[PDB]
Amino acid sequence: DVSFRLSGADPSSYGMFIKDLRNALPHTEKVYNIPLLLPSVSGAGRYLLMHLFNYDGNTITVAVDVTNVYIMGYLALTTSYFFNEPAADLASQYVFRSARRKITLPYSGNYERLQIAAGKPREKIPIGLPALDTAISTLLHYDSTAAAGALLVLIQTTAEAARFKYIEQQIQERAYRDEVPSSATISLENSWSGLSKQIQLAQGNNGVFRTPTVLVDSKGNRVQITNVTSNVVTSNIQLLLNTKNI
Numbered sequence: 001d002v003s004f005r006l007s008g009a010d011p012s013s014y015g016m017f018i019k020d021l022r023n024a025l026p027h028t029e030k031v032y033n034i035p036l037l038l039p040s041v042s043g044a045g046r047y048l049l050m051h052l053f054n055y056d057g058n059t060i061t062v063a064v065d066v067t068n069v070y071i072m073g074y075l076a077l078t079t080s081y082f083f084n085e086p087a088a089d090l091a092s093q094y095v096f097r098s099a100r101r102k103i104t105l106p107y108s109g110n111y112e113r114l115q116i117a118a119g120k121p122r123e124k125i126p127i128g129l130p131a132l133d134t135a136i137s138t139l140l141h142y143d144s145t146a147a148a149g150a151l152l153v154l155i156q157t158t159a160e161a162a163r164f165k166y167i168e169q170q171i172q173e174r175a176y177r178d179e180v181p182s183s184a185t186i187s188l189e190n191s192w193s194g195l196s197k198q199i200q201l202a203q204g205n206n207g208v209f210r211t212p213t214v215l216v217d218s219k220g221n222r223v224q225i226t227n228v229t230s231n232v233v234t235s236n237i238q239l240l241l242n243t244k245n246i
């Protein structure tokens with residue numbers, strides 16, 4: 001398991017948590033020096049538990065699929081919650097079985113569905129460490145519309161930062177003041193599968209992507225990424241989605 005406390009949190013302690021989160025995910029191989037997540041993991045070992053504490057010391061435990069970094073559901077006090085999708089229903093066979101009741105959220109965990117449920121795109125939802133504290137707090141008591149926005153904050157501040165050093169740094173910049181994600185952040189989120197696939201197809205193609213990936217840069221300028229020498233591959237991405245899952 002890995003844990004993070006919002007009480008006394010700062011950039012350094014958040015960076016330790018994102019470190020712990022990356023290092024909890026198993027890999028047997030690196031591709032261009034980036035850990036390659038596993039094609040599959042059988043049984044309960046396919047879920048990592050993240051214990052999150054709000055500033056008041058209240059806590060939820062979040063289940064994360066190690067193969068993909070997808071959040072499946074979470075436990076808050078004696079109630080478990082899971083997205084409405086087959087992968088989450090499977091997870092519910094393995095984690096938080098001791099919950100007195102299990103509520104299936106009324107949406108799946110994907111960004112499109114979550115934004116619809118929340119009523120706003122994530123371009124418009126501030127993120128940062130205060131937003132994470134609020135999200136933990138929201139999830140402690142069931143409210144499906146409030147929870148969809150809390151989960152957009154949670155997914156970005158924990159999974160997405162583990163995937164990209166740039167996103168981790170964005171959240172560190174927002175340790176004491178939230179701010180909507182940069183358009184570079186959103187682009188990276190939306191490109192993780194595509195980047196993960198192209199980095200792996202480069203292995204037998206001399207470092208060159210089979211199909212270029214388009215990203216927004218820190219300047220808000222669209223860029224083409226065409227090979228593994230890009231700063232996106234050498235510096236920024238931290239985990240690859242296995243192409244067996246793409």
Ligand SMILES: *[C@@H]1O[C@H](CO)[C@@H](O[C@@H]2O[C@H](CO)[C@@H](O)[C@H](O)[C@H]2NC(C)=O)[C@H](O)[C@H]1NC(C)=O
Pocket residue numbers: 208226227228229230231
């Ligand atoms: C591999 O990617 C690099 C970019 O990371 C390409 O070089 C850049 O692209 C053009 C020049 O061709 C310029 O706009 C950039 O300033 C270049 N940057 C650097 C640091 O060289 C390169 O062309 C790509 N190589 C292949 C084989 O696709």
